[PDB]
Design a protein around this ligand. Structure first.
Ligand SMILES: CCCCCCCCCCCCCC(=O)O
Length: 131
């Protein structure tokens, strides 16, 4: 499953995606080399994601199908839910400032974790390798 420690390996169109979100040139360069690592653990229907990066270290806890709030490193607030679809986790979120939709998907491909995002017509991916 998703269980395990994952470390980012490569990105696809991440800087353009961050530009759309409103992130400055400098912060995009730092964002793209954030050394993000995720430690995922499950307990029933609830997941615990320990996010660790050059920017911060925090725990994210969520129950499938129940909305929760999550903030980006820069303070941008989102609210949404994750649900299990087939073998994938599909996340439906909204920016609380502008009300715009942001979708995220987590899926396993071989031994890699692929995280895809879409926002205002732009797609980006972050691919992680298992530790
Ligand atoms: C510099 C800003 C990068 C923005 C990337 C989009 C973040 C959306 C991901 C949603 C994650 C929710 C918490 C989780 O399940 O780990």
């Amino acid at each position: 499953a998703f269980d395990g420690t994952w470390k980012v390996d490569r990105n696809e169109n991440y800087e353009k995606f961050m530009e759309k979100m409103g992130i400055n040139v400098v912060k995009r360069k730092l964002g793209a080399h954030d050394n993000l690592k995720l430690t995922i653990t499950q307990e029933g229907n609830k997941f615990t994601v320990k996010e660790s990066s050059n920017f911060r270290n925090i725990d994210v806890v969520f129950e499938l199908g129940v909305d929760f709030a999550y903030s980006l490193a820069d303070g941008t607030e989102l609210t949404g839910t994750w649900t299990m679809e087939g073998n994938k986790l599909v996340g439906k979120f909204k920016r609380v400032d502008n009300g715009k939709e942001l979708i995220a998907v987590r899926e396993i491909s071989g031994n890699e974790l692929i995280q895809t995002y879409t926002y205002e017509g732009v797609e980006a991916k972050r691919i992680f390798k298992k530790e």
